[PDB]
Amino acid sequence: EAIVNAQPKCNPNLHYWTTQDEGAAIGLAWIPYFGPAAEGIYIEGLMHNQDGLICGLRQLANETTQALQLFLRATTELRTFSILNRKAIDFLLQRWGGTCHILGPDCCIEPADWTKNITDKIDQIIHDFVD
């Protein structure tokens, strides 16, 4: 499906915060004893609504809530950290969880360059045919 922002308003600019998980450490700043406190581990950035991405993100998070809440109701983990890892696993299972039938729609194997390695190396026998 495609997302349709159906909210009363949209802030088209996204002033975000996150953590630089492994940013270029400066000297001893990576050592917890010397490094920043909890309030000073954040980087910031500003994103604009190019391709309508910001207003699409707001609607996407809005539409994600029902499925996310139902997943949380069904789990017994107090804190869930594995959603993205399971989505990466499901990405691989849908592509590689069965037998990959080459040239089939569900097999992501491209024999392009190397069909042009058999079909051009036929010329090592068909006209290397010296009689």
Partner: protein, 251 residues
């Protein structure tokens, strides 16, 4: 109805799980997978304390749940609650270990007061989450700054300082149809709060009271009421004092 996943196709965002993905769509690392939190502010919801508190309610029988997110949005309005029952017992649970306040808040509306609290936990009546420090919860924790928001999940393509101001409020009948709020100028000077009041107006009104000398000069409580003559949409797109407990009016 599995958890939707955001992906960019034809220069446009859209939902498409790992099973609705074409062979051209490429995922080379878990780094391309990101969980983000977006604030209800950005969708145009009313952010004043009277309007925001009515979106929250107490309920028993539902265990709280927590999910993490990696990136969040700078908030204009955050909330921090210290609510007790009239008998003095706490209405909200202490923050679990590792749950800290939302990291970017221009205004922190700290509300202290009383209510019946007919429920073990306080939930969001519209299903939204309470966003803390990279952790989203279904319930409100005591004295912990949060922003209202929702979570999204993304597949990324391969490819001004921080100022914070605390605004304090007193409340009675919290979480009910008859809830009264008071903006705190000091421990003895208060203003009857209405939904029309913006954070900047509260800070300017509070400055006027100090810079003109309208704080209570006794040991008793002074409640100023703003009369409807003094007027006060989205945050991103923008007097005479007479006294008549001790109620008064500001014209």
């Amino acid at each position: 109805r599995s958890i939707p996943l955001g992906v960019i196709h034809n220069s446009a965002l859209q939902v498409s799980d790992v099973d609705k993905l074409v062979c051209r769509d490429k995922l080379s690392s878990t780094n391309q997978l990101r969980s983000v939190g977006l604030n209800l502010e950005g969708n145009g919801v009313a952010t004043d304390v009277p309007s925001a508190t009515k979106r929250w309610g107490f309920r028993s029988g539902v265990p709280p749940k927590v999910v993490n997110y990696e990136a969040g949005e700078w908030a204009e309005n955050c909330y921090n609650l210290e609510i007790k029952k009239p008998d003095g017992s706490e209405c909200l649970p202490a923050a679990p270990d590792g749950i800290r306040g939302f990291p970017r808040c221009r205004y922190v509306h700290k509300v202290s007061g009383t209510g019946p609290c007919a429920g073990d936990f306080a939930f969001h009546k519209e299903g939204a989450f309470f966003l803390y420090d990279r952790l989203a919860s279904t319930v409100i924790y005591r004295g912990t700054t949060f922003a209202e928001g929702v979570v999204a999940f993304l597949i990324l393509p391969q490819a001004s300082g921080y100022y914070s101001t605390t605004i304090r409020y007193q409340a009675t009948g919290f979480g009910t149809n008859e809830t009264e709020y008071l903006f705190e100028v000091d421990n003895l000077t208060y203003v009857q709060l209405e939904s029309r009041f913006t954070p900047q107006f509260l800070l300017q009104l509070n400055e006027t009271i100090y810079t003109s000398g309208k704080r209570s000069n006794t040991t008793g409580k002074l409640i100023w009421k703003v009369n409807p003559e003094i007027d006060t949409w989205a945050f991103w797109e923008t007097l005479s004092f007479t006294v008549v407990x001790x109620x008064x009016x500001x014209x």
